[PDB]
Amino acid sequence: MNLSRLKLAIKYNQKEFVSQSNCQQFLNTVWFGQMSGYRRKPTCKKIMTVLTVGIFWPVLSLCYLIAPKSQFGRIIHTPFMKFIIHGASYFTFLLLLNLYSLVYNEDKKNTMGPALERIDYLLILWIIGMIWSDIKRLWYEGLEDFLEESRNQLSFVMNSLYLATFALKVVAHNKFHDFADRKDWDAFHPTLVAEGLFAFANVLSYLRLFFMYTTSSILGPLQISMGQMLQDFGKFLGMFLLVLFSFTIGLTQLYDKCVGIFCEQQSNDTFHSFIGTCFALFWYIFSLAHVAIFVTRFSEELQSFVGAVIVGTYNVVVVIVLTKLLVAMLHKSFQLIANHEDKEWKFARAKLWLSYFDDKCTLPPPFNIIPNLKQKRDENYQKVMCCLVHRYLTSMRQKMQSTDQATVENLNELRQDLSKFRNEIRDLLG
Amino acid sequence: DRIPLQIVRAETELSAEEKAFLSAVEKGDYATVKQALQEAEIYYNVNINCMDPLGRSALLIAIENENLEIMELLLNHSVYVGDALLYAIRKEVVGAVELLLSYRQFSEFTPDITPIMLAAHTNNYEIIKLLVQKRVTIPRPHQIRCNCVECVSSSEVDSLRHSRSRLNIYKALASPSLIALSSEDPILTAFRLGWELKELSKVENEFKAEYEELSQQCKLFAKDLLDQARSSRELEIILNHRDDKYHDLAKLKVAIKYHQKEFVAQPNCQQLLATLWYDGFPGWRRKHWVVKLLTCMTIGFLFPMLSIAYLISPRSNLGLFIKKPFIKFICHTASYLTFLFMLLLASQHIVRTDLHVQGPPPTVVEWMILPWVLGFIWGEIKEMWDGGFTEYIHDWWNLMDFAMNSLYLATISLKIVAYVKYNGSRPREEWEMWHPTLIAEALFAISNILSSLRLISLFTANSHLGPLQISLGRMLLDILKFLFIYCLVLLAFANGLNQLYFYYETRAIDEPNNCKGIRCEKQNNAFSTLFETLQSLFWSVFGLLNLYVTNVKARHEFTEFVGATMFGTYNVISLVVLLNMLIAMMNNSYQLIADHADIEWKFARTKLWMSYFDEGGTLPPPFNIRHADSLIQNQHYQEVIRNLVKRYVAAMIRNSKTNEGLTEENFKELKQDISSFRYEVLDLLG
Amino acid sequence: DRIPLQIVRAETELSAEEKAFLSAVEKGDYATVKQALQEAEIYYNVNINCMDPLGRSALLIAIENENLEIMELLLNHSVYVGDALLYAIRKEVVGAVELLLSYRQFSEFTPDITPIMLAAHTNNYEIIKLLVQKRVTIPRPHQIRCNCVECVSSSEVDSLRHSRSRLNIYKALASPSLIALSSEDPILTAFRLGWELKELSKVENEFKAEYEELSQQCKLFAKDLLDQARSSRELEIILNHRDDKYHDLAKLKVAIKYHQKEFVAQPNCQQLLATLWYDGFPGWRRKHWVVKLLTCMTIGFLFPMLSIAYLISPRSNLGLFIKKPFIKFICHTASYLTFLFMLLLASQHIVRTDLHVQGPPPTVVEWMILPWVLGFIWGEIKEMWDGGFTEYIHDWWNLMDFAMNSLYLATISLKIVAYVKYNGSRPREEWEMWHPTLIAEALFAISNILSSLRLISLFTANSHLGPLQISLGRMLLDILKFLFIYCLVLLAFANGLNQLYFYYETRAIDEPNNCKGIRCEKQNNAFSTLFETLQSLFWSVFGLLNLYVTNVKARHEFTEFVGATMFGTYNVISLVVLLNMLIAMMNNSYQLIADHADIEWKFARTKLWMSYFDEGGTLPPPFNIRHADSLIQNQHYQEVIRNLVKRYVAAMIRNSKTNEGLTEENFKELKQDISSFRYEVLDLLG
Amino acid sequence: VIRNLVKRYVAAMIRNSKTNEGLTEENFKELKQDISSFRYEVLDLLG
Ligand SMILES: CC(C)CCC[C@@H](C)[C@H]1CC[C@H]2[C@@H]3CC=C4C[C@@H](OC(=O)CCC(=O)O)CC[C@]4(C)[C@H]3CC[C@]12C
Ligand SMILES: CC(C)CCC[C@@H](C)[C@H]1CC[C@H]2[C@@H]3CC=C4C[C@@H](OC(=O)CCC(=O)O)CC[C@]4(C)[C@H]3CC[C@]12C
């Protein structure tokens, strides 16, 4: 089962071809593989099966790692299963991240360059494995294709930042192993940087899970639909940026003559710098009163008033005029999207499924680290193609014949016939 | 350069003689065709069974032009008639009679299509009747999940064929005409089939649309038969027919079970139900709104009186009054409202109870509330008993009833556990966090929320709030789906922020006013613990989280900046992106929902009305203190069904004739008709 | 009981014989009709000119059935032929020729309709041509608002007729086919007529829709003729034709004047313009995305030099380079961008100045900004002069340019004034509220905002941003209307609130930190004054107004409650209602605008491209230091137009024949064709 | 005036129907019958 054409279809973005029932049927058969009854089992039984497979994902993986021929080793082959096993692996990883702080790093609050707790070490393995997977994938498939789909693109940064985090940790453990109070640490102390980067990666890791939505028939369409509209936001972004800076400049010009929006008592310092002016206006966007109207100067009434007008106008333009527009755009956008959601979702899910169809990737990340006839084929293809072509022609013939409505031309043609017959007879009979 | 164009799908070409023969058939020159046939016999220069490049042989070309004369001529001579019956059925000609009467690869029909199936797929009552007259059979479609039969478990041989074959049988079984002609209870079968098709749509994901289309077809058929009723006698005979007491609106009930919404909403059906609902108030429709209002008010006020009379002597005139459904509804609504008023009094100095008596004695108000609570629970028990867990569970509101009742029970239990083990009266501030009394009060309040929200159910009754309620409920589903997406967003950022600030957590003691958390005058440690993080991000959606919650005490610029960026991104994604998308999504949904609100609302209202039509009913406070006949009934039903089916067939034809453009093929036939007439006349006159 | 039904407005009835006569005409029985006529001539028993219940006579029945044989028969017997031509023209048949050749009370046509007018309304080129061949004239409609002519003062009598008659005339003059056959320059005629019709749509409030429709008909006609161009030589001959230099895209300019957006956006037209725009950049668009960026950036950086070269040696390689439209755009944009960058440098206050010096000497950056300012001014001056005030006034951005520039002027004036006077230095605090320096700074800031927001215009040059910019503009009009309503509400609540709290105003000194207003740490005296009340209500829209501001210190409970209630009602009306309604309205428009987004954007883009296509152009900083020919041109234009018209007429006909369904009239015609045919044959065979 | 307005109205409606109503299947059937009936008649006379 090379599934060459199927793959070329996805390459050439043949969404309709991929969403045609005949193709969907073929796919499902392959996806569930021998686990066909799965389709028939009642929701309850299916739910149970899925959970069971996932829980023992390491065990099943091990079986394949040891006796791929074993019935269990075979279980991982079923594309559907691999998905479950690989999905569980990721979830366990996310768990490790969660238990990293909630239930660890309890006495290293003030230890600069802290040691590498086992959690860190384990996580390391997973990160490595996930990286390797990307490489292998990028290798086999290619580059642009790999970069095209998001789960991969996020997988790059995520893995990157994760890599940096652990690196800096090693450097810190060496250079700075002090045990001073956290407060006394320099703002850019390696440990501080690592923790910040690690945290951000954690956000990215979870966001990645969005891909799984495609599989669900309920939330999958919506997930895809949202992504579609996520493009039209870009347009709005450009417009807003211009507005943000336009007003930023003016505010700074009128005000440049503990500190910032982020303090209990918001200071006019919000406008003193430029970046601050940007932040300050940024929070106004949300229209939930994140920044007070204290644009007043310490004292300059006029100067303070004009400032109020400037900020007020910004709010009216952005919070009201621009936003409502955004909604309008989204509304129109979704309408059209709603029309083809099925096709789009199907194509997406298929692209996802095929990834598992391959035999190249079988082992979840943590384990993954552990490493002529042609004439006949063509002949048959031609036979089948001949049939499909004939069927197509006949079918189209019938469809048109039974749908295409008569036209004035046809009427006129008929009337001509009646006339010609009329005349002919009239002449033949004087 | 140039791109060469060569024919690769090589195909043999028809001899000039052959080609000519085919052309004559298309023009209807019986003579020329006749001559050609005769000559070919003697001379053998043209295969009478030749075919156009488009696969149109002579018999087929004749059938499409519907020239039965030429058809007979061709058939008389030995012309292959393979699959011709099928073409004559697809085209829906009644020249099928001729082919059936004669009886002596690259097919446009799959190997599974049998004449009866194709006729059914076409829905030609006549053509179908012909075939059915001769013994005909459509294979049984093994039930869903019939994998047990190795027969179906051998789908491995050819799945696509199996699936397609299955759809073809159902596409046939679900034809309104075949169900009219072959089924004993056309209405019941359509109900059942509709359901099965629905279920299959789910199991067979591919072909989902197809199965769903078929189900709607079955649902429409049943409604249409109902619409063909011309007297109330017929409507009763139909709606009160029990397959196997009677006179219980049995089929109306089965229709509600199978979600046959349209059937239930049919005008006539609604009218009958209304008469039963408003019994005791004839002309209630004509009653002035004010008058109505007055009547309702009085009855509700006297609800206790009516409730008792029944208990004492159901036979009593008064006893009789509460039995009427509309009354039951009004009485039962008043009881609930009274209950809710009791709940309101509980929060007042109506009884002015002390607030330091741990394990206090139940107040009078609480005492009075108890009976009702008991009635509500008892009602639920009966509901479960009288309806089975399935029905009870199915109902969404039974879920809320359960929750409300369960809380109103834990409240009682905790109250008791507190009367005992707590005879003192220590200061409220001294009471521990989980003092039973405190927990009890909490549960009671939560339930008071649920109880007052149950009133939304009553809206289904009004003609204005009802449809609105239904539409909103549908939209709620959409919102639920969005929340799932959002949730992942929340979780992501929650973990990130917690992972960044968990180091900088501080003891509540350190905090001002010994308060630690987002719900403190000075919001502090909002991201220190995960749970706080989730809550904090949740509140930030409502702009109740201050921005000074992102600054670490030690003032580490880098960390604070990363945090602020993370918080800001969350706010953009949630408030500016997801929120706005939800709005657009919802806009679309409402447009669609609005269209079917009526059928959705009426179905809902009918279920409500039906609930009261039943006999077992008393308000919650006072809630806890022949073969012969069958045959005749069935005969009457069959009589009505015969009439309805007849009326339906005729109406559908009329609609098809009065609402269908003249396709091109139709024109072609007319042209061929003139052509044939011409040739004939020319010959006779020449 | 029973309602008797009678014919109230009775009309004469047809005798049996007369009924038969008309019946024959509907069946096409020439023989019977002929006989009836002949007998009537003898026994005078039938009024040849009788009328059906629908008022149709024999000739009218024949015309509708299109039986010219019978028509001739009737005409030969001299039947009243009144208005028959009009009926024939409406049926669009060659019976018109017969009636015209046959030359010498109730009507479906108003008394004003004339044969040519109706033909025009029908848009049948052939029938129109036939009528025009014979002298025919359509009255010239008086100019919009021509009261001088007492003839227009006829409106006093039967204005209805006056209005209808006028619309009928225009409905005819606006027929694509008439314009094609009669007008010398079909394109220009359409352009002009489409505009006049638009103006009329406004003046004639009623019948607006009709005039607007007719206008669109004209606009589309022009685009359609252009679409029938096949070679560039033609397209150039058409778009560069000057009615009367040439090679100046004169017609395209006229189109832009008459807002013929579809014409200006036609694909082929847009293609030509592009070639002119990207002169020197073969396949600039084709150039890899990055490549484009590279080239643009490089050219931009070199803008001063290129500009300098043109200044030095207009006739040099470099001097010529700037003349290219795309280069001008690149340069003129880079210049503006640098201007904005200079303004940014002020923000960072790279050149810091003491805050105490009154009227300081203009800072270094200022001087640098001064030239651009002057250049922009002179630019606008040139535009105004060159284009005339009307055109300049028309441009909306011109308003922004005017405002931006004016602010820059004042800023300078004040800067200057503050220098001569206030020459000394004092602590800023001492400075009076309206110190010149202070006011100047504010004006400068506002101007900077305006200047940067002028970049929005550049979005029209982008394929992605442009359409959005255009849509936004369209919506802005509606937003303005909504704002008026909001303002009224604001004023109302402002007046009310101020009316209640003005009794409780307090002194700034009294107020903590001597701060009075809604912009102080603890908001105070929010509703004390109308000016403040207005501000407070505005900021409330954004949630920046705290609720404690609704309480009076003396603590008069009632007043405070009314005050809070008024504030609350305002919030609901403004945020919950009006704001939300704006969303709905904007969604409605965005939907519509989206339908014509591209044409709008492209029309806009062309206008921009055209501006640069001209020759008077240098960046703002360096901005301030034979009849024979016409005959030939016209001949060519006429030839091209002839061909375009020819191919257009044909296309329209072909479309109709292949893209139109068969209406009932068609059935009736066929039925008649067979009927008359039958009768004839039967007679011959009999 | 009413007499005139009704006459004008009725006529307009008929025109609208004729020009804005498609040919239905029943129409096809009638046309077919007309041809068929004519055929039989002619064939009988000529036969
Ligand atoms: C708006 C605030 C004051 C809350 C009021 C709470 C209740 C007093 C309201 C809320 C919903 C109302 C119910 C909404 C639906 C109906 C249907 C209504 O019946 C009809 O509208 C049509 C006649 C019919 O029921 O057959 C009878 C009143 C009732 C129970 C209403 C009774 C009064 C209710 C319980
Ligand atoms: C987003 C923030 C950083 C504000 C940036 C302000 C400017 C640097 C941006 C805002 C709008 C941009 C302009 C938007 C429109 C265009 C059209 C663009 O041309 C095209 O896109 C297609 C080729 C063509 O113009 O023919 C040339 C760049 C330009 C002037 C852009 C130049 C860079 C601008 C001025």
Ligand SMILES: [Ca+2]
């Ligand atoms: Ca219940």
Ligand SMILES: [Ca+2]
């Ligand atoms: Ca200008």
